[PDB]
Amino acid sequence: QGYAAEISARRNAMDNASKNAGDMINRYSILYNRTRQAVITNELVDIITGASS
Amino acid sequence: ANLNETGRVLAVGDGIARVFGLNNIQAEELVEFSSGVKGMALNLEPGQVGIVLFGSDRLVKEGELVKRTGNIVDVPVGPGLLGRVVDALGNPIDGKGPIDAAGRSRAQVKAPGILPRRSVHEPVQTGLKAVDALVPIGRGQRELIIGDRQTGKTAVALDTILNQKRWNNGSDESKKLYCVYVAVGQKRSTVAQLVQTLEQHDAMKYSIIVAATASEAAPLQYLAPFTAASIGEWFRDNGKHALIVYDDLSKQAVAYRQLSLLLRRPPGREAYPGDVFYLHSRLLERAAKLSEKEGSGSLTALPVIETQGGDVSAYIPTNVISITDGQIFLEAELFYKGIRPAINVGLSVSRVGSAAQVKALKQVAGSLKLFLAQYREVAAFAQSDLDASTKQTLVRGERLTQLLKQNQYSPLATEEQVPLIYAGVNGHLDGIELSRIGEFESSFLSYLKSNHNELLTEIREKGELSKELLASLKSATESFVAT
Amino acid sequence: NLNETGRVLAVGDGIARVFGLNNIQAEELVEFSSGVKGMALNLEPGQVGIVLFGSDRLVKEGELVKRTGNIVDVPVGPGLLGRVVDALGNPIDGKGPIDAAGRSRAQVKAPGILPRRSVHEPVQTGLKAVDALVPIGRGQRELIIGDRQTGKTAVALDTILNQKRWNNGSDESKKLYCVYVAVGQKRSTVAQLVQTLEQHDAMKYSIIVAATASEAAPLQYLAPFTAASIGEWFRDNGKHALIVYDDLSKQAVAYRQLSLLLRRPPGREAYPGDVFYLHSRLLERAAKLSEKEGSGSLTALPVIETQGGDVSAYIPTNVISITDGQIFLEAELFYKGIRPAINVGLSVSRVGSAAQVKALKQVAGSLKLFLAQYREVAAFAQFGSDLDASTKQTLVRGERLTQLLKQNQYSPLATEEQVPLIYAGVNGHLDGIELSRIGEFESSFLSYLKSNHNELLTEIREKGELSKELLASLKSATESFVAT
Amino acid sequence: TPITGKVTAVIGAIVDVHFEQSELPAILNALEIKTPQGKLVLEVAQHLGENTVRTIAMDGTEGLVRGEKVLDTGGPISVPVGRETLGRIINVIGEPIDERGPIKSKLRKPIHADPPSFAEQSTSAEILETGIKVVDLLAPYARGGKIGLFGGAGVGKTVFIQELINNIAKAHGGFSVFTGVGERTREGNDLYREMKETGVINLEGESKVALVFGQMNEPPGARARVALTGLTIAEYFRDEEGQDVLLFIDNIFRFTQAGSEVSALLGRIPSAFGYQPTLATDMGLLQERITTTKKGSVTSVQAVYVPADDLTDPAPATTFAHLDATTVLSRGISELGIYPAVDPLDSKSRLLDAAVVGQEHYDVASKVQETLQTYKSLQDIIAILGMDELSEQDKLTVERARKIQRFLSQPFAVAEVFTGIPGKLVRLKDTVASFKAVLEGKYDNIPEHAFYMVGGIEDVVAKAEKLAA
């Protein structure tokens, strides 16, 4: 019983873990798609400045 | 041909036109080109003038005549602009003929300083159960509507305007809110279909549409919110109350970036120029409540910003958030589910509209503000326990969440709202099914209108709830809930 | 004739474009008729681009600019000791004229392949964690790197404060003279720092070269080089200087400002193409000379500041390339109590044990590698598991060794004080002691040895090494104190 | 017979003026153009050659014509200095903008001045008790020191400055100076009306504060210079009056931002992020003038905008080293309803040292910082796997950080309309004694919500009894 109590606490803690790990993947997918664009834009400003003079 | 009054075009590309001469032109003066297209004198040099076009470059050739105007960029203002749709240079585009104008304010006007203002205290009534209870907007305030693509942003502004019909038919000159809806970079059809919605609801008569749409040259879009401000300011300056809606400043900032990059200004954060904060700041600072020494007139701005994927830390979102007096933040996650208006309460604030809340709302919405931001506490940590203590909160919250849900084009009076929030706050819904909360409103409000119209008239008249009227609201709600 | 003099063509932003000056050398000092000095960095056909070492407010088109005939330089010599000067060596402590032995130029070549010797001498810092794990030798360049407010200066400062132990003696070879270069710091902070230095009586063997936040960028640019030259005097004359460059981040930034206003086409993050050379040539000057050159040393401790712990950023990568190792400081570790907030796994000293008193080397056997073992373990512990004896034994030891290496500011420790505490730690004698009592253990144990076993601490300080006779005595001493 | 030039070129805030005589106006001089309305003030920024100077305008350049006659005042923009500035409201150019006639002061000092020398530095270590718990406990401000409030949009900066004003200004002895820079005209009007309704400004008698405004409706010229006006006035009290001076700037970022709006029109190759190459030196020149000298003392509080909540942006990044105490306001903290939204860990004082605050204070502060940190080091695991996967030692230290976290929130007096709670003000000794006990684990039985938005220790006990039944 304890063991079955456990197996039903484990598939619950992990169910809630995946549901919460996916919430962080939403934060870090967006921040990434941001930081990726920012990187490219700032290298591009560097290139444009270097290309005026 | 004078070289002082007249010019010849040296070159034209990338939205700029270079003109030789115009030796008596003013910095920021409108010009007229051979073809009728107008421009602004942006940069004034030895031997040439840089002119930004208000239209396609196709419309200006090298070797062309350019005449001075004498006038700095401006628009017609006055009361004759109600029920009209102009473009950014105040040119009438509804086909309804010449604009009847009291005169011509400039596009760039300075905002009234520290002295000529008073604090906000009067309600801009939105008729939206969520806004008016939880984020009250004052007359003179600047409240930003902010949220992702397609989250009912415009809907809040629009239903606010359609709610003004209430007093904009009346005799009382002071509770009248004249409107200005500014379309920046929108589709031409959306704006035409939007007018038609102001027309049907008979709201068009007290509003003004200024439109610089998706296809129009950037400087027109850049210009549109400013020439809208001057149009609005007239009411503020003449002891009346105008509401201005900038829809949206995102697209204006985009237009302005185009202009800036074509002009080769150093691109900063997200390739916006150094001065994009300033672009908005000078705009939104022209909203004010004036002191009685200046005629008490009030401009009120509801600018719209579009976030990307819910991120409010982006450059343009944080700039305007640090200009405005609060944000109504609308959320893609709520809107997906049905909770519309999708006013994410936690992340929404009015900074000065406190004083401006109708007392009767403030009374039945007593700390509803800080409870709902805290029903959000348990509801995010209950998806962990079956607690009897914290299940009434989850059933106050859930009922209240359905109570603030609203159909569109259905704005409500103050008097219709206070008893709905009484029935919520005081728990009169706890036994009623969730799927019947929407049927409770419509049945209840009829029951109220058919019997208890004495109580409903009285909330409207006072703007307060007497202990008598609250001891009565108790009887009528318990009576209807039992049947 | 427009050879020795020229006329300003345009001016602003601390830059001046000068006509003429037809016989001026690249990098020569110039004088403006208004009083302000400057330096020629651009010699173009039409004109000379000049950066000023002050304001421009008093310069005007047409004004007359004058050759000095000299590549920028500074007064040098033991006369600068106890003094505070500006970038060009002008006295800013308002205590009158510096006396100069001579004048080194600002930009000196570094000693070559040949005039050198392997660093074999301690720069005893008196900080337990530095001296034991990341030991600094005379002639090394050791980088102090971290986010703002992590304790970078405190590391450099405690080191200066420690040299009092030797600087007060007759013996010159052991004496270590200190130069603290302030760049981009504000005046009140540099003030507050000299005030701390006088309280410990450390100013007398120091020189502050300060080019602060309000001063012309070219003053900030130049400061670390002239300070290098001021420091070089010691090295070049068989004495030993320590130079703290606090901080090279702010310097690079000035260098960037100076160059953009000269219109030199920018590079990465707008820095100048050669912003690496900027530091590489600065830091190569720090050296340990050969016998033929009198054995003098210049030890550099440059400081770098990162943003959000980003050690992959542009300048920090440059400087890490250059130095002989670094001390990494972390806010995360500072708030955990670990002070100095040294990241033991990331910090290194390439010079290594080579410049570390044998006494301390012997007691700190594999201390750093054990602390590495302690780190991996406290991560196997994190995921919730009680382990076996040996694994929880190293979990106990490393937790206390860490605590032992914690250390109050302005409290540098002598080697003969450090060796006992370490010996006590690594050999198990602390495992019996409750963790929140290790601090009080240290000072009591120290005071116990000073009064009772002074024999040993006198011997360790004298012989520098540890005979088995000193090991057996220490084992017998420590174990004795453990049983209070 | 004055020194006249003519306008050759106009772009935005930048106006190029040509001088017919070979006597050209010095850099930093104010020039003037007669307008139809009043007077447009230009400041000389550089000498372009061929008898032309480049200038920055202090107001909109609409209507300016190539040819326009330009006067040379032969001096930098001056401001009325002296006691006759108190209770008055003032332009970037000194002019009085409160309608109340002319500031009839006896003198007019330039807004550009050279910062005090190294010899003229006066270092101290004296705690400025603010009454705000987090400050007094973990990052205490310094009398004569420099205090910066970093925060993004709408996290709490202005309200924080407002409580600082309300707490320390009203009864301080010395004279205050508030300088609004690139913020809300409305906030100014709000502050003006406040100081009248608190007796700090008295129209019909004596006053304590001097007002200087250059807000976000102003051209970048005003926004660049107005911080120096405010400053110059604060220097006269410090130097020529020995006064301990309270200087308040809100917001100091808008000055750097202002300067980055002109930089390119002034013809400069941009630096990182679009900023002026002179960003650090422009800051040195301004900041290094706000300082306690031997003649007088200047405690100052400055709000620091952080753009796009990015502390690493060259602007706020550069500002950190100019400050004796920084308090950082965090959105993530504010979004939890904790206020002040102060980051207990990322906020710093020079004075958090046992010599100044007392060993006890220090020990308690450190143990509190230790506690919070251990929770923060465990966030990834709390979030994914939850509390139940921690060891019990941690589970205990976490449960205690959670309490201290809340116990650092405080009702402000000016924030009274958003909390709906009388604004408590807690003494430094009390804060120290209250946190010490919570560390000893005396109040573990007490639920978290009791520590939230209260004062000292007794208030938690009061709330704990209030909540049980």
Ligand SMILES: Nc1ncnc2c1ncn2[C@@H]1O[C@H](COP(=O)(O)OP(=O)(O)NP(=O)(O)O)[C@@H](O)[C@H]1O
């Ligand atoms: N209270 C409401 N109840 C139900 N639907 C609504 C409500 N408010 C708005 N909508 C609908 O939701 C959709 C998008 O709303 P809208 O007001 O256009 O948001 P938006 O932010 O302007 N989107 P866009 O302008 O395209 O970025 C439209 O079909 C609206 O009619």
Ligand SMILES: Nc1ncnc2c1ncn2[C@@H]1O[C@H](COP(=O)(O)OP(=O)(O)NP(=O)(O)O)[C@@H](O)[C@H]1O
């Ligand atoms: N060993 C130590 N133990 C405890 N506190 C310390 C220690 N060393 C330094 N501190 C304190 O930590 C704070 C910051 O240290 P500091 O030496 O200024 O580092 P920093 O990185 O140079 N800061 P900054 O120059 O402002 O970027 C100061 O309050 C110091 O007094």
Ligand SMILES: Nc1ncnc2c1ncn2[C@@H]1O[C@H](COP(=O)(O)OP(=O)(O)NP(=O)(O)O)[C@@H](O)[C@H]1O
């Ligand atoms: N101390 C506080 N307690 C409770 N709520 C606060 C507090 N400070 C700020 N807030 C809330 O946050 C809002 C913004 O605070 P405010 O002091 O204007 O910050 P700010 O950084 O000056 N804003 P901005 O300049 O526009 O970026 C207030 O109107 C309140 O709703």
Ligand SMILES: [Mg+2]
């Ligand atoms: Mg829309």
Ligand SMILES: [Mg+2]
């Ligand atoms: Mg430092």
Ligand SMILES: [Mg+2]
């Ligand atoms: Mg603010």
